[PDB]
Design a protein around this ligand. Sequence first.
Ligand SMILES: Cc1cc2nc3c(=O)[nH]c(=O)nc-3n(C[C@H](O)[C@H](O)[C@H](O)COP(=O)(O)OP(=O)(O)OC[C@H]3O[C@@H](n4cnc5c(N)ncnc54)[C@H](O)[C@@H]3O)c2cc1C
Ligand SMILES: Cc1cc2nc3c(=O)[nH]c(=O)nc-3n(C[C@H](O)[C@H](O)[C@H](O)COP(=O)(O)OP(=O)(O)OC[C@H]3O[C@@H](n4cnc5c(N)ncnc54)[C@H](O)[C@@H]3O)c2cc1C
Lengths: 340, 340
Amino acid sequence: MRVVVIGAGVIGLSTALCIHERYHSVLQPLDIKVYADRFTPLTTTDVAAGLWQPYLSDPNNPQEADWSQQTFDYLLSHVHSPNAENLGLFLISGYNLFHEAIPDPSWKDTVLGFRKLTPRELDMFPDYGYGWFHTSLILEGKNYLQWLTERLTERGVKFFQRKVESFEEVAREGADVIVNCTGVWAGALQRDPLLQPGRGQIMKVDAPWMKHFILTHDPERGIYNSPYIIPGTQTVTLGGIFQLGNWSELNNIQDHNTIWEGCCRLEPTLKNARIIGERTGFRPVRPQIRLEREQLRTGPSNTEVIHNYGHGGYGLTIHWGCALEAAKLFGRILEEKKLS
Amino acid sequence: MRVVVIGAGVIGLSTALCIHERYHSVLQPLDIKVYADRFTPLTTTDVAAGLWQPYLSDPNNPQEADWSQQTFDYLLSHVHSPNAENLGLFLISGYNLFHEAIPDPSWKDTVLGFRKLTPRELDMFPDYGYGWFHTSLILEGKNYLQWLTERLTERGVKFFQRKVESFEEVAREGADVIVNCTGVWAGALQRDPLLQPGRGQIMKVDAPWMKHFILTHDPERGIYNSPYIIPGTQTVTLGGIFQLGNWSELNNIQDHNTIWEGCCRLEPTLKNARIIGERTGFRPVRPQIRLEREQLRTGPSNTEVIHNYGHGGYGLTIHWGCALEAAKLFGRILEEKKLS
Ligand SMILES: Cc1cc2nc3c(=O)[nH]c(=O)nc-3n(C[C@H](O)[C@H](O)[C@H](O)COP(=O)(O)OP(=O)(O)OC[C@H]3O[C@@H](n4cnc5c(N)ncnc54)[C@H](O)[C@@H]3O)c2cc1C
Ligand SMILES: Cc1cc2nc3c(=O)[nH]c(=O)nc-3n(C[C@H](O)[C@H](O)[C@H](O)COP(=O)(O)OP(=O)(O)OC[C@H]3O[C@@H](n4cnc5c(N)ncnc54)[C@H](O)[C@@H]3O)c2cc1C
């Protein structure tokens, strides 16, 4: 049973880990390899703050809400272990601000102590007249990716640095199952018109007195096109950029100024903070995540494919539920091949 | 009108400032000097984490409830100014954990979004079954003391490093009003058996993922004698030491281990944290703060004295209201001396 995972971000690596730990005992030769063009420092996953929070409006598919729930409950049970620091995982409380009232989110019972903001709290944010407060989790991609890598290494999983031209090429070399975790680039292996870049840009700043997150919202501009501030372990993320269709992997001055001005209005104490870095990434926007099987018909006998991509702006939020779902699908492949 | 302020802790400097800012225009020669033994890096105020939170049970003097409230609103309306970093002021949320049920505190409407810990939250803490959650402020003494200083310096307040043997000495040399802000050492100038040292021993640690304060309680052990973790700007404070009558200003190994063990139990990710430093200090314990006028019968005409000491383990929490009251008492002196 040769299994090739394409992609080394949160989705690929988490899926790879789930598959190994769940099926390495019920398969004699279980060889899992990971192919990726880019690894642990240079992925979209690295650009993410790693704040756990789904989109405001309900998901196109009600499964995602469970995958999110599952992810939260899992990371929560581990928040207080010694692993936590290596993971980059910790608790954080903060604000979601709006101009008008809005219905409570679906995940309001997932997070800790969800409530609405009080007048005193609102006075701290004059540009806004409504919002929430709650306690969530942060999984910093850069450390989490490092953890996964090392978990996988000790499990015999080999990593190879290469760009895959097609599924057929990988099947031609001997893969029985191909797990597709190519994020926003998935379309280069199989035309997917529903998958598009959600380009974002962020600023890492030194502001260690920030202990709360602050997400602003505005329908007039779109999800995550509003200033936000996310305290990390070493630095603070400043963001607020979302651009459908933009494939430019390049820091932009205009976006720089938008991040910087937005967040300063929001938190005046930021004016003297020192700028550590700046990065651009592409959210794999898709009306819903593609998490399904497909039999790639090719020659004598076809090869199995599990697609796992299109997690948009909530990959770290949902990755675990997805992995478990991918592993179940892997489960079914085995029983059909009558190997369980 | 010669005013001599004794003491350079948060109480001395804030009182000094609050008096100068309010009466320099209504008095032609208002020459204010600060006399102190120890200054801005080596005082009790420097050892304090700076968390705003009064004692758990109501104070035998209900003016204190107001003095703390006045302090909270003052710092809160300054949290988003460009001066916040300079003062060491910032918002922080966190947990108060208890074994049994306890009644809500008097200051429950002062803080932001005070509420009870939900079952899910309490599970993060196995050794506790009750508690609160809210949003407070931190005012780090070291920064604050430095800010107060530069403000006084530019107001023309002169500082002098010297140990004052008696009030008589200070009147004898020309003081018309003496402000007594000598903290726990007040008794060396005027006998007062109620004022006693509450020794503490904190530990500064590098754990930048900690975003919440965690305070544990136990009546079977005493106030601030139970483990607590308070995240600061550059480092995290670990404490839980309150010893009545102990005058030893020296770090104790047994206290170390107690701090270190109780905080690890409470937050296991602490195990691998780097220890930056450790310090001892003396809370000026008194059943209530002495903030009152007195006449010293020194020579032909008596000199005025404003006493402001005995702030216990809540001096930063209450400092501003005290300084306003002292200033008010300074005004009552003026009109009586026929100078208002
Ligand atoms: C600015 C920004 C902020 C974000 N903040 C958050 C947040 O706070 N919380 C949250 O949950 N999410 C956040 N996200 C979203 C999150 O970053 C993504 O949903 C997640 O990173 C996507 O993971 P992925 O593994 O699918 O893709 P990626 O992390 O991009 O990994 C894709 C992998 O596939 C490889 N690959 C692609 N094609 C090939 C090929 N042909 N051959 C070989 N390898 C290939 C790439 O090299 C890479 O290794 C943010 C995104 C951005 C841009
Ligand atoms: C471990 C610890 C943690 C704490 N944490 C907090 C907290 O989180 N929040 C909070 O609100 N409070 C906290 N406190 C309490 C706080 O530190 C004290 O309440 C406060 O600092 C007292 O201020 P002060 O100005 O009276 O005295 P100090 O800061 O001790 O200053 C006294 C001044 O008087 C001078 N002086 C005294 N006698 C003479 C003399 N004869 N001649 C000349 N000068 C003299 C001294 O040199 C010094 O300059 C904590 C205390 C400790 C020990």
